Structure formats: C-alpha cells, structure tokens
C-alpha cells in the first residue's frame, strides 16, 4: 500500500529537518568553543612557564617506584549520543593500552568519565572503582579540581603500599597513571592520544627572582594544580572534538536521508500509476464484457 | 507489554515498576513455548498457568 510510503516520506522529512537544525547548532557550538579553548591557552602557557622557571634550580611523585605492580587509567567519553566513532576510537586506544599492560603484566585500575564508556564496561564485567558523571559538553574548573584531587590522593597512597602489602598508605595503591582522551588539532580530523602523568623525567638543556628556601613545598603545591590544568585542557579538547564529530555525523545523516526520500517518492509514483492502470483495465473489461 | 516494549527501546532510564512489567511480560512469553506433538492435560495446564 502507498499509505506506508506516505508515512515513511513524512517521517524522513521530519528527520532531515531535525538533522539540519542539529548540525547548525553544532557548528555554532564549535565556533563558540574554539574561542574558549584559545582563551584558556594563555593561562596554561603562563603556568607552564612559571613551573619551568621554578624547576630551573629547585616530592615522591617525582621519584620512581622500585617495583611497580598496578597502573591507573582514565577514560573520557561523550555524555550524549549522535557522535560517530568518537567513543569507539578512545575505547580502541584503551584496549591497546590494556594489551600493552598485559604484555608488561601490570594490572589496571579503571576510572571513567561519561555514560557511554561506563555502559560499555558494564556489559564486559570489568570492575569500575569510581565513575564521575554530570558532564554536558561544557566543563568547568570544579569537576577538574575534584577529579584531580581524588586521583592525586589515590596515587599518594601507593608509596608505603607496595602493591599487595596494605602498608601505611592503605590498599589499592597505584604505581603509574595514564590518560586517554581525544586530541583536536585541526577541523579536518582528530586523533585519540594516550599519555602518562605520575611518572616523570627531568629534561636538561643549556642555559634575581627568588623566595624563601622551601622549594619542595612550592613543588608540592604546584603539581596538583598542574594535573588539574592538564585534565582541564583534556576536557576542553574532548568537548571541541566531540562537537566537530557531531557536526560531521549529522551532515552525513542528512545526506543519507535525502536520497532515501527520493527513492520512496519514485516507488510511490510507480505504484500509483500501476493502480490507475489496474482499475481502468478492470472497469473497461467489465463494461465491454456485455 | 508488547505495546510498551517498542516505546521502552532506546530509553536512558526507566522506573522500577516499568522494568518489573517488562520482566513479567518476558517470563509470561517464555512460559508459553511448546514443542510439536506434545499434548498437555487440563490439570497440568491450569497448574502451569497458576
């Protein structure tokens, strides 16, 4: 029947209008988010410069552990839907980190941001210790601050806790921290990138401002906010990349809907012509049969 | 249940009453399976339905 064809046609029209509206909102969002990330950049540059200046002359976080046994990992994902492969890519990277860790033999400790990655982990029976949720593509310093506080508190409880031994630090110590997030460097494409935070190395290059003779306190007060700034930048990059991917996917959806509408219209037209011919043939045969 | 299952698809969150209704409907649908050439007496029928 052609009634189903008409229903499909109107539904496809509705979905294509929704798609164009969504993609226009998305491109406006990327336009307004590029400004925010580029405005956040200079403060990060200043923080990096002052940290490098402090490190120029003069901290368990900067001292490697004798025998690592565990490793902590962070995953970030979009809280909403309609983002093509955006979560798939970061989950692929997480899986290959897991493979590398199995090769090294160090057990992972999972941390998740966003509903999609939590849902994926639920079906595969992988334990999650802490799941932050509440992102809506627009981050703020509060979420980054609390996440950084929790992670730095957790890692500091891994020194006297030599893995299996629940020492003075307490159980669930972690020897290495890693980050997985989507990096946005150009509008054409974006690539998922892994990283590490807790292990560090000092880079030496060839070559007055001063303070009281306590630089260790300055380092211990600057490192947690360094991690907070790093995760803040990661969140901004993730938001920008998610918005761009949403734009691309929505455009593809519209370009997939239009030709389907055309094909349905053609089928409906041929069906109508066939029907007309059928009844006219039947009536003329009945008439001239007398 | 058959009318509600379609609506429940692609739903982020559902109430406990709704999911209980889905569970009961699934159990009821499962119970009604029957192989060929397996006649059942009325007494066993009413016992199974109860």
């Amino acid at each position: 029947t052609l009634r189903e064809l008409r229903g499909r046609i109107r539904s496809a029209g509705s979905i294509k209008k929704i798609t164009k509206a969504q993609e226009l909102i998305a491109t406006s969002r990327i336009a307004k988010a590029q400004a925010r990330v580029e405005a956040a950049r200079p403060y990060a540059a200043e923080i990096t410069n002052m940290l490098t200046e402090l490190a120029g002359a003069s901290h368990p976080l900067l001292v490697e552990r004798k025998q690592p046994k565990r490793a902590g990992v962070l995953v970030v994902s979009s809280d909403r839907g309609l983002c093509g492969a955006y979560n798939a890519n970061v989950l692929r990277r997480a899986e290959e980190l897991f493979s590398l860790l199995r090769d090294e033999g160090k057990d992972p400790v999972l941390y998740v941001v966003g509903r999609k990655a939590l849902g994926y982990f639920s079906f595969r029976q992988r334990t999650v210790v802490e799941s932050w949720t509440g992102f809506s593509e627009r981050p703020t310093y509060e979420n980054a601050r609390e996440i950084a506080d929790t992670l730095v508190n957790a890692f500091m409880a891994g020194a006297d806790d030599e893995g299996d031994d629940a020492g003075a630090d307490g159980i669930l110590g972690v020897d290495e921290l890693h980050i997985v997030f989507t990096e946005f460097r150009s509008m054409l494409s974006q690539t998922a990138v892994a990283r590490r935070a807790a292990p560090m190395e000092v880079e030496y290059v060839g070559e007055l401002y001063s303070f009281e003779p306590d630089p260790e306190t300055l380092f211990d007060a600057l490192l947690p906010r360094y991690i907070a700034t790093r995760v803040y930048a990661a969140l901004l990059e993730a938001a920008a990349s998610e918005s761009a991917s949403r734009r691309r996917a929505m455009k593809s959806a519209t370009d997939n809907a239009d030709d389907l509408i055309k094909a349905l219209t053609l089928a409906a037209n041929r069906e109508r012509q066939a029907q007309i011919t059928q009844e006219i043939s039947e009536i003329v045969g009945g008439a001239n049969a007398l | 249940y058959r009318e509600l299952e379609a609506f429940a698809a692609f739903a982020s969150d559902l109430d406990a009453a709704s999911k209980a209704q889905l569970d009961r409907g699934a159990r009821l649908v499962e119970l009604l399976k029957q192989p060929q050439y397996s006649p059942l007496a009325v007494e066993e029928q009413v016992v199974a339905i109860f």
Binding site: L51, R195, A197, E201, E203, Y204, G206 | V47, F50
Partner: peptide, 28 residues
C-alpha cells in the same frame, strides 16, 4: 500447591606519548 512449590524451589539447582619537565640547568 504453594507448600509443594516452596518444597521444590529449594531442591532445584540453578544453571547459572610522554611528558617531560623543562629545566634550564646544563646537564650534569
């Protein structure tokens, strides 16, 4: 019937990149 159900229910088993800090001091 409910007594029999309760009796039988207990007797049945269930089948189921890296980061680096920058220091201006010449290398030791």
């Amino acid at each position: 019937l409910v007594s029999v159900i309760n009796e039988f229910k207990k007797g049945f088993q269930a089948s189921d990149e890296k980061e680096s800090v920058k220091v201006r001091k010449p290398a030791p």
